Amino acid sequence: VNGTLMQYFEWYTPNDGQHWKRLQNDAEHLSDIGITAVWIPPAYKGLSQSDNGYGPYDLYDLGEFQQKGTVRTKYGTKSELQDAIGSLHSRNVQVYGDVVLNHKAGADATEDVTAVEVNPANRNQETSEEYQIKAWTDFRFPGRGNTYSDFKWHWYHFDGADWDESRKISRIFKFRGEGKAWDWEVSSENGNYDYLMYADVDYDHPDVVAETKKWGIWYANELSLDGFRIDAAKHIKFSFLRDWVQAVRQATGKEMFTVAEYWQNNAGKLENYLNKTSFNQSVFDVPLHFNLQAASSQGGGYDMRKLLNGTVVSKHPLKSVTFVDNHDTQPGQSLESTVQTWFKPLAYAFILTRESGYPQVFYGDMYGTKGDSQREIPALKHKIEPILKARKQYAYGAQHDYFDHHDIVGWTREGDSSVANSGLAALITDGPGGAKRMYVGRQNAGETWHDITGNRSEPVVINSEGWGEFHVNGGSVSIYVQR
Ligand SMILES: OC[C@H]1O[C@H](O[C@H]2[C@H](O)[C@@H](O)[C@@H](O[C@H]3[C@H](O)[C@@H](O)[C@@H](O)O[C@@H]3CO)O[C@@H]2CO)[C@H](O)[C@@H](O)[C@@H]1O
Ligand SMILES: [Ca+2]
Ligand SMILES: [Ca+2]
Numbered sequence: 001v002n003g004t005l006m007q008y009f010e011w012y013t014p015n016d017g018q019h020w021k022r023l024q025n026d027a028e029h030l031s032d033i034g035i036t037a038v039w040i041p042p043a044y045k046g047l048s049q050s051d052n053g054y055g056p057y058d059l060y061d062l063g064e065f066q067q068k069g070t071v072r073t074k075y076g077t078k079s080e081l082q083d084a085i086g087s088l089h090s091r092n093v094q095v096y097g098d099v100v101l102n103h104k105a106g107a108d109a110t111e112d113v114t115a116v117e118v119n120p121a122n123r124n125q126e127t128s129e130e131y132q133i134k135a136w137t138d139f140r141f142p143g144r145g146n147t148y149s150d151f152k153w154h155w156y157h158f159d160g161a162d163w164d165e166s167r168k169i170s171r172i173f174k175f176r177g178e179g180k181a182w183d184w185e186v187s188s189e190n191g192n193y194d195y196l197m198y199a200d201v202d203y204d205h206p207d208v209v210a211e212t213k214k215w216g217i218w219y220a221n222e223l224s225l226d227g228f229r230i231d232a233a234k235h236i237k238f239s240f241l242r243d244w245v246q247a248v249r250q251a252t253g254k255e256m257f258t259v260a261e262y263w264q265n266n267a268g269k270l271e272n273y274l275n276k277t278s279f280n281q282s283v284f285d286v287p288l289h290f291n292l293q294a295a296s297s298q299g300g301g302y303d304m305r306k307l308l309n310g311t312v313v314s315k316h317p318l319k320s321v322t323f324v325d326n327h328d329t330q331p332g333q334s335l336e337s338t339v340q341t342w343f344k345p346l347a348y349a350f351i352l353t354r355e356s357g358y359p360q361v362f363y364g365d366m367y368g369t370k371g372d373s374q375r376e377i378p379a380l381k382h383k384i385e386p387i388l389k390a391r392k393q394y395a396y397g398a399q400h401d402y403f404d405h406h407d408i409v410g411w412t413r414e415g416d417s418s419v420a421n422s423g424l425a426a427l428i429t430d431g432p433g434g435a436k437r438m439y440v441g442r443q444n445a446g447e448t449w450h451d452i453t454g455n456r457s458e459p460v461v462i463n464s465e466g467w468g469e470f471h472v473n474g475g476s477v478s479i480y481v482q483r
C-alpha cells in the first residue's frame with residue numbers, strides 16, 4: 001500500500017485543549033481514507049498555554065505539570081494524547097512527533113552574561129566590544145521538579161540570545177565563555193545561521209548533547225512514537241542531528257522514520273544536508289512547493305513542462321517528502337506562499353498519484369484554516385478524498401510521463417497484478433482543456449475507464465494496444481480508472 005502522511009494541525013487550531021480528543025475521534029476516518037502516518041504538533045509545554053509549541057519551555061512536560069499557569073498544553077493533557085495515539089495504533093496508523101531542539105523560550109529568570117553583538121547579515125562578524133547583559137536563560141521547571149530528569153539550564157548551555165533585559169534592547173548577542181562559538185556545520189546564509197530566535201542551544205556542549213539524546217529516547221518511549229519531524233534543521237549542527245537520530249534508533253530498535261524541515265528553495269543545499277547526514281533522513285521538498293505555487297499564480301503562463309526542474313524529488317526520490325502547503329505557507333504566516341485554490345486539486349493529484357516521493361496532506365487544506373484574513377483556505381476535503389482514493393487503490397505499477405505541452409501534462413500508472421483493477425491516467429492543465437493520447441499498458445486493453453474526480457462524465461475506452469485518448473477541462477484535473 002502507498003503510504004500517505006497527514007499533518008494534523010494548522011496555525012489557527014483553537015486553544016480549547018481538545019485537539020488530542022479531536023485526533024482520537026478522527027482515527028477511524030483517517031485510516032479509512034488511506035492515511036498511514038500522522039505528524040502531530042509539538043506536544044510539550046510552551047512559553048504560554050496558547051503557544052503552538054515552537055517556543056518550547058520544557059520538553060519533559062507533555063501536559064501533566066502545573067507550569068506557565070496551566071497543566072495542559074494548547075492541545076490537551078498527556079493522558080489525552082496517549083489515548084489518541086492508542087486509537088491510531090489500533091488502526092495501523094503511525095505517529096510522528098514534532099521535535100523542536102534549536103532553542104528554548106520562557107525562562108524562569110534572567111542571569112548576568114558577558115556578550116558581544118554580531119552583524120545580523122554576517123554572524124561571524126562581531127560588531128561591539130564585550131559587555132554585560134541580563135538574558136533569559138535560567139530554566140528551573142518549578143512545577144516538574146526532578147521528575148524524569150534533574151537537568152537544569154543556564155546561560156552556559158546556550159550560544160546566544162536576542163534580548164537584554166537590562167537595557168531593554170533587541171540585538172543578536174553571542175555569549176562569551178569557555179570555547180563559545182556559533183555551531184558548525186549549519187546553513188551558511190547570513191555567514192552562519194546557527195542563531196534564529198530565543199535562547200540558542202549550544203550543541204558544542206557535551207552535557208547538552210548527552211541530555212538531548214536522553215530526552216529523545218525518553219520521548220519516543222513515553223509516547224510510543226514511530227518517527228520524527230525535525231524543526232528548523234538548517235539552524236542546528238548537522239552532524240549532531242545525524243547522531244541524535246541514530247542514538248534514538250539504536251536504543252529503541254525501531255526504524256524511526258525521520259523528515260527534516262530544511263527551509264531553502266535550492267536543491268543543491270538540500271543535497272548538501274542529505275550528504276552531511278549520511279542519507280539517514282528525508283527532507284521536505286521545498287523547491288517543489290515553490291514550483292507548484294508559481295504555476296498556480298501565473299494564470300496559465302507557466303510552462304507546465306518544467307514542474308520537476310530543480311526539485312529534490314527528481315534527484316533523490318526516496319528521501320523527499322512532498323507537500324502542497326503547511327502551517328508556515330498558509331495565509332498570514334511567516335512563509336506565506338499559498339497554492340491558489342483553483343490549482344490545489346491539481347497539485348494534490350501531482351503528489352498523490354506519481355510514483356516518487358512520500359506525500360503529505362495538509363489539515364488546513366482538508367478542513368479549512370481559521371485565521372482572520374479574507375483569503376483563508378476553504379475546506380477542500382470533498383475534492384481531495386477522491387484523489388486519496390486514487391492513491392490508495394489505483395496508483396500502482398509502471399509510470400509513463402507526458403510532460404510535452406506548456407499547459408496540458410499527464411502521466412499514467414499501468415497497475416499491478418496484485419492490486420485488482422489498479423492503474424490510472426491523470427491529466428492536469430494550468431490553462432484551456434484538451435486531450436492527450438497516453439499509454440496505460442496492453443494488459444488493460446478493452447477496459448472502460450472513468451474520471452474518479454467526477455469533473456468529466458464521459459468514459460474512455462482503452463484500445464487494443466493499451467492506449468486511450470483522455471480529456472481534461474480548463475484549469476482542471478481528471479483521473480481515469482477502471483469503471
Ligand atoms: O502503518 C502503515 C505502514 O507503516 C509502515 O510503513 C512506513 C515505512 O516503514 C516508512 O519507511 C515510510 O515509507 C516511506 C519511505 O521511507 C520513503 O523513502 C518513500 O519511499 O515513501 C515511503 C512511503 O510510501 O512510511 C510508511 C508509512 O507511511 C509499515 O512498513 C507498513 O507495513 C504499514 O502498513
Ligand atoms: Ca556553540
Ligand atoms: Ca541554532
Ligand SMILES: [Ca+2]
Nearest residue numbers: 300302406407
Ligand atoms: Ca501553461
Ligand SMILES: [Ca+2]
Nearest residue numbers: 421423444447
Ligand atoms: Ca485493468
Ligand code: NA
Nearest residue numbers: 159183201202
Ligand atoms: Na548553537
